[PDB]
Design a binder for this molecule. Structure first.
Ligand SMILES: C=CC(C)(C)OC[C@H]1O[C@H](O[C@@H]2C3=C([C@H](C)CNC(=O)CCCCCCCCCCCC(=O)N[C@H](C(=O)N4C[C@H](O)C[C@H]4C(=O)NCc4ccc(-c5scnc5C)cc4)C(C)(C)C)C[C@H](O)[C@]3(C)/C=C3/[C@@H](COC)CC[C@H]3[C@@H](C)[C@H]2O)[C@H](O)[C@@H](O)[C@@H]1O
Lengths: 5, 231, 103, 152, 95, 231, 5
């Protein structure tokens, strides 16, 4: 799934 | 408890993957009202990122089970009640962090880097609230998320290089907000592409210390752009 | 289907195959090819029964089930000596020795 | 040189005994060691659960005679194309005239009595030095080494 | 064809291709001096009796028929009473 | 709350990864004083397995930190304070599970499969006490562990064929007990090989239904034997 | 590490 940090 | 004793307990809790204990220690450090060091700021971020990330993962699984149990009234009701419990825990965790950000971290941030870090984090925790919010409260939560990201973005554009890990990480998380919360894929792609292209143009200026973190975030920006342009 | 045969006369034994659909006359041509006696100088037998030149090996009861590579069917052979056929004569094979006590 | 891999990729197989033998299926473990699996009677089929890259070989349950599986002496599963089970056609090799005469005597005479028989004395050693899986694994090891060196 | 003659004087006429299953018969039929037009394709076995030699000839047919065969290979039946003589003959004949 | 509701809410808790809640749900069923069926029995085990497993994992990490702070007085003190708290949770969990076993389950259990399951679990939860315990206290807890394993073992030897997952899983944990606790590597290697030899002997009679768990344990037996021979 | 179930 899409990445967040 | 001394500040150093609490930070050492947070580091022991991190090595034991006890992120709730880490969050309780780093909360108690933050509520002393001194500006956090880069290490202490990073410990606070890792603690609450893992605590909220676990509840978000549980919430998605239970929400998918509630949807797949349509026509089984008793199972659907049990899945709903358990979803609403996780939403309460997630809301409490987010409001705890937001209270720390607003009372102790954002007002005491002396450096542009610390301000952008905490405003990005404020935007992230309101985004997590907006994911689980229903009815009229959702609009106010979305507006707070957008305001915190825009304020972080205006500071980051003036005071930080395009290749800076925190500026890249802000563009990554704010593009995900445009996609997942505002249903604005063109704005998400435009922001992520602009941040990637600006950071590529200056990549040769990057220090060895920041090289690994910035290139990892640029990779995530590219992977998101690929996904959202196929959709 | 193929049939595996022992053509036997006195102390002579020929191992050959043939088609189940082949005739007794065609089998005599195989014997002519080996023993240099023409088919009109040959009588073929199954046990004591004289075979007809127009019958197939299958119609004589040589089938792929009865005439196997490891257990070929016997065909008796007698030759014409002058104006008359010799009697069907097939010498028995040697008897095996007594089975050793360890067996 | 002959052992199974810890693949973790399932494979559905059917062992078909195309022989009048009580067959002993044998799997080679991760260290190459032959694990004997309980037998398949004459003419029987049975459905089997196994994995891709696990190594099977076959024996007779009596005198430890070798058997083929899909013409090969060793069997290693594939994946199941369209979910269809793999046929492992267990079959007899054509044993030599010598060896089949040894097998018949092994079944009918107890070992201690072999050295009474009126034969050339090498046929005592040939009787005694049975079919054994170790001999075949150490043979197939040298054959694999040879066929690899021929391809290098 | 070749003629295989047993110790008791029985003549077995077998196809040359089948008799060449035996390494010993092949050597006896390919020996130095065996390109003369007067070659008798005959092998005389002074020690192999007809009951054993008959079974060897059946084995040659069996071996050729089932070598490289598609089909189920039937058991080659050996009676216990001949098994020792047949083993000695098979070892001598290299088959 | 109904048995049916609590058992279904345990699966909701499982899917949500809330094993603490799952254990509470299955405890609420267990306090009805009725027997648990094969499904219900296995749910109770899977719940408390992960609840104690988290504390066991956290304990091993913090104990390793206490050695890695050798001579750093105040930090090792803080590590011991952190350890003995996690031991207290682990201990209390084991005390609660053994309470549930001996109060409700072990008297009411009908089938030998259910008895040997609960007597293994008695053995196991006394073994997890023997893991953390020190002093003479450990000796009586080890005797309790060995007694419960032996009582299970002599029943399994009669009422259950070798290829059964519970007979293999008992033999596995009991041979592991001989290694970890009793300092009996030869007896461990004896039991583990005997269970492996016995399970192969009847492997054709084992169902497609029971296959999977037994051959997982037969992999683990071999890998344990590979370790205990390399040591 | 060694396996238990
Ligand atoms: C929440 C609760 C609910 C859902 C209600 O239930 C929970 C669970 O309850 C049940 O399980 C229970 C249980 C647990 C289990 C462990 C969980 N399950 C797993 O997670 C799955 C496996 C994961 C491991 C992967 C492994 C990846 C590696 C693969 C290697 C593959 C490999 O290479 N294997 C080889 C192999 O298999 N070969 C080799 C060759 O290829 C062939 C193959 C061959 O021989 N095949 C068979 C065969 C046989 C005969 C032949 C022949 S030959 C001639 N003829 C024949 C016929 C041929 C082949 C081998 C073994 C030789 C090395 C845990 C729980 O703590 C619980 C409740 C507790 C307890 C515990 C309780 O102590 C109190 C005791 C034990 C337990 C029991 C109760 C379980 O019974 C359900 O059964 C579960 O399904 C269910 O999940």
């Amino acid at each position: 799934r899409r990445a967040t940090v | 408890m001394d500040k150093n004793e609490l930070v050492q307990k947070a580091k022991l809790a991190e090595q034991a993957e006890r992120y709730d204990d880490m969050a309780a220690c780093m909360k108690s450090v933050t509520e002393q009202g001194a500006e956090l060091s880069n290490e202490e700021r990073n410990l606070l971020s890792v603690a609450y990122k893992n605590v909220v990330g676990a509840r978000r993962s549980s919430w998605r699984v239970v929400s998918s089970i509630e949807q797949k149990t349509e026509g089984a009234e008793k199972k659907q009701q049990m899945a709903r009640e358990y979803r609403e419990k996780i939403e309460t825990e997630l809301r409490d965790i987010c409001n705890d962090v937001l209270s720390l950000l607003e009372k102790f971290l954002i007002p005491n941030a002396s450096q542009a880097e610390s301000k952008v870090f905490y405003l990005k984090m404020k935007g992230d925790y309101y985004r997590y609230l907006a994911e689980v919010a229903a009815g009229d409260d959702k609009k106010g939560i979305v507006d707070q998320s957008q305001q915190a990201y825009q304020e972080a973005f205006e500071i980051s554009k003036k005071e930080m290089q395009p290749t800076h890990p925190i500026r890249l990480g802000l563009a990554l998380n704010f593009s995900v907000f445009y996609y997942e919360i505002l249903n604005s894929p063109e704005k998400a792609c435009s922001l992520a592409k602009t941040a990637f292209d600006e950071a590529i143009a200056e990549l040769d200026t990057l220090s060895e210390e920041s090289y690994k973190d910035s290139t990892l975030i640029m990779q995530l920006l590219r992977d998101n752009l690929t996904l959202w342009t196929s959709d | 289907m193929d049939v595996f045969l022992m053509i036997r006369r006195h102390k002579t034994t020929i191992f050959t195959d043939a088609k189940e659909s082949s005739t007794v006359f065609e089998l005599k041509r195989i014997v002519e090819g080996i023993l240099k006696r023409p088919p009109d100088e040959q009588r073929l037998y199954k046990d004591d029964q004289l075979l007809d030149d127009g019958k197939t090996l299958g119609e004589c009861g040589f089938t792929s089930q009865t005439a196997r590579p490891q257990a070929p069917a016997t065909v008796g052979l007698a030759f014409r000596a002058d104006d008359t056929f010799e009697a069907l004569c097939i010498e028995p094979f040697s008897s095996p020795p007594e089975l050793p006590d360890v067996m | 040189v002959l052992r199974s891999v810890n693949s973790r990729e399932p494979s559905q197989v059917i062992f078909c005994n195309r022989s009048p033998r009580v067959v002993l299926p044998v799997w080679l473990n991760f260290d190459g060691e032959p694990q004997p699996y309980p037998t398949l009677p004459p003419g029987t089929g049975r459905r089997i659960h196994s994995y891709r890259g696990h190594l099977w070989l076959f024996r007779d349950a009596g005198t430890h005679d070798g058997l083929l599986v899909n013409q090969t002496e060793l069997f290693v599963p594939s994946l199941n194309v369209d979910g269809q089970p793999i046929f492992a056609n267990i079959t007899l090799p054509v044993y030599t005239l010598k060896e089949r005469c040894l097998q018949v005597v092994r079944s009918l005479v107890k070992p201690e009595n072999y050295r009474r028989l009126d034969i050339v004395r090498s046929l005592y050693e040939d009787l005694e030095d049975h079919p054994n899986v170790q001999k075949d694994l150490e043979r197939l090891t040298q054959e694999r080494i040879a066929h690899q060196r021929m391809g290098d | 064809y070749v003629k295989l003659i047993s110790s008791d004087g029985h003549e077995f006429i077998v196809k040359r291709e089948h008799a060449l299953t035996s390494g010993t018969i092949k050597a006896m039929l390919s020996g130095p001096g065996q390109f003369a037009e007067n070659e008798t394709n005959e092998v005389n076995f002074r020690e192999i009796p007809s009951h054993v030699l008959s079974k060897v000839c059946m084995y040659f047919t069996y071996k050729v028929r089932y070598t490289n065969s598609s089909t189920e290979i039937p058991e080659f039946p050996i009676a216990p009473e001949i098994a020792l003589e047949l083993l000695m003959a098979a070892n001598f004949l290299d088959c």
